[PDB]
Amino acid sequence: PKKAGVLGSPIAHSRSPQLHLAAYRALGLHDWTYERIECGAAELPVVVGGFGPEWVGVSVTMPGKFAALRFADERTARADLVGSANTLVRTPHGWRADNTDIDGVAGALGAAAGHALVLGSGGTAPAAVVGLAELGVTDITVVARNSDKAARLVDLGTRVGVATRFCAFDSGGLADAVAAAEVLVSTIPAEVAAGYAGTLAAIPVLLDAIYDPWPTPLAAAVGSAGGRVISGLQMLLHQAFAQVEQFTGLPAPREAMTCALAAL
Ligand SMILES: O=C(O)C1=C[C@@H](O)[C@H](O)[C@H](O)C1
């Protein structure tokens, strides 16, 4: 019997356990556990360092993804690329960090086209840029309140080979930018995105990182316009696949986990 779980703060509303435990059950690992652990960035090394032998790995959500990357002694190329880690996996002599949020975005969208818009400069925005690139997006516009963080974002886009640019939230380029874009990935609070819903509504595809509560005003706006709408639950589903494979050494049982998600 092995142990995994999810670290973050707050953590009470994580739907990670539902996904992972459904996977372990489908895989015949009926005796494995997965627990929610209240844990801020400073406490991450306390918790992970205290893990007994039977811990195979842990998921890490806000606010500890930067601490997780630094705590690990090995990091995947992609974890380095986005600058944070949502996944710690025990190895012979320590921990390996990875970032599966990239899979979260690429897998949730399933397929992307040419032009994308990313709302927000932090959180899962870097993963969204890399995932969009993975899908064959040639062009990305970063709409964000923090011009400095957004500068680092365009740089990453530039580095993964995507024509990438910045646009201020109230500069007046939002209509233009929405017009050229096929896909919108929003990583900002629903409360913040809400006021721009009218302008963003015409995007053909929305990926909203938010999942609770649902629908966000943005999702409702896009939905009413007939755009394809994908919630953060779909993101959660797809980032979890690679975590299950790394924790168990077995293919993610996607159907079982998709069923578990429908229950959510
Ligand atoms: O349980 C959750 O809500 C999450 C699990 C993390 O691995 C994901 O990266 C995301 O941050 C959320």
CATH number at residue 67: 3.40.50.10860
- Burial (CB < 10 A; 0-12, 13-18, 19+), residue 245, is middle
CA 176 to each of CA 27, 107, 135, 206, 227: distance values in angstroms, whole numbers, following the listed order: 48, 27, 23, 17, 18
Q: Do 38 and 75 belong to one domain?
A: yes
Measure the CA–CA gap between 181 and 203, rounded to whole angstroms.
7
Longest pairwise C-alpha distance within the chain: 56
Q: Do 147 and 257 belong to one domain?
A: no
139 Cβ below 6 A of ligand 1: no
Q: Are strands 183-186 and 115-119 parallel, antiparallel or unpaired?
A: parallel
Residue 183 φ/ψ, nearest 5 degrees: -130, 135
248 Cβ below 6 A of ligand 1: no
CA 35 to each of CA 6, 99, 264: distance values in angstroms, whole numbers, following the listed order: 6, 20, 18
C-alpha triplet 242, 127, 129: angle, nearest 5°: 130
Q: Do 235 and 106 belong to one domain?
A: yes
Nearest atom within ligand 1 for CA of residue 240: 7
Residue in the block written with tokens 């938010």: 210
59 Cβ below 6 A of ligand 1: yes
Burial 141-158 (b: 16+ CB within 10 A, else e): bbbbeeeebbebbbebbe
Q: Do 121 and 6 belong to one domain?
A: no
Residue 148 φ/ψ, nearest 5 degrees: -70, -50
Contacts by 203-210 with C-beta closer than 8 Å and gap 24+?
Answer: 203/117, 203/178, 203/227, 204/228, 205/109, 205/112, 205/230, 206/230, 207/105, 207/108, 207/109, 207/128, 207/183, 207/234, 207/235, 208/232, 209/123, 209/124, 209/128, 209/185, 209/235, 210/186
Residue 56 φ/ψ, nearest 5 degrees: -95, -25
141 Cβ below 6 A of ligand 1: no
Centre of ligand 1 from the C-alpha of residue 101, in Å: 8
- In the chain the first and final C-alpha atoms are separated, in Å, by 26
Q: Do 118 and 172 belong to one domain?
A: yes
Looking up residue 155, the CATH number of its domain turns out to be 3.40.50.720
Residue in the block written with tokens 């993804």: 65
Beta bridge partners of 140: 116, 164
Domain containing residue 176: 101-239
Residue 153 φ/ψ, nearest 5 degrees: -65, -50
Q: What is the domain count for the chain?
A: 2
Q: Do 107 and 235 belong to one domain?
A: yes
Beta bridge partners of 87: 59, 98
Annotated catalytic residues are: 65
The H or E element spanning position 26 is helix 16-26
CB 64 within 8 Å of CB 7 = yes
37 Cβ below 6 A of ligand 1: no
CA 193 to chain centre: 17
Q: Do 226 and 109 belong to one domain?
A: yes
Q: Do 110 and 201 belong to one domain?
A: yes
Helix (H, G, I), strand (E, B) or coil at 86: coil
Q: Do 129 and 185 belong to one domain?
A: yes
Centre of ligand 1 from the C-alpha of residue 74, in Å: 20
Closest C-alpha residue for ligand 1 atom 10: 61
Expressed in percent and rounded to 5, the helix, strand and coil fractions of the chain are: 45, 20, 35
Indicate the resolution in Å.
2.0
Query: Closest Cα to residue 10, out of 42, 37, 47?
Result: 37
Q: Do 173 and 222 belong to one domain?
A: yes
* Neighbour order of strands in the sheet with 115-119: 163-167, 139-143, 115-119, 183-186, 205-208, 228-230
Q: Do 254 and 206 belong to one domain?
A: no
Q: Do 121 and 234 belong to one domain?
A: yes
- Burial (CB < 10 A; 0-12, 13-18, 19+), residue 186, is buried
Burial 67-101 (b: 16+ CB within 10 A, else e): bbbebbeebbebbebbebbbbbbbeeeebbbbbbb
63 CB-near residues (< 8 Å, 6+ apart): 8, 9, 40, 41
Centre of ligand 1 from the C-alpha of residue 173, in Å: 32
Measure the CA–CA gap between 197 and 242, rounded to whole angstroms.
32
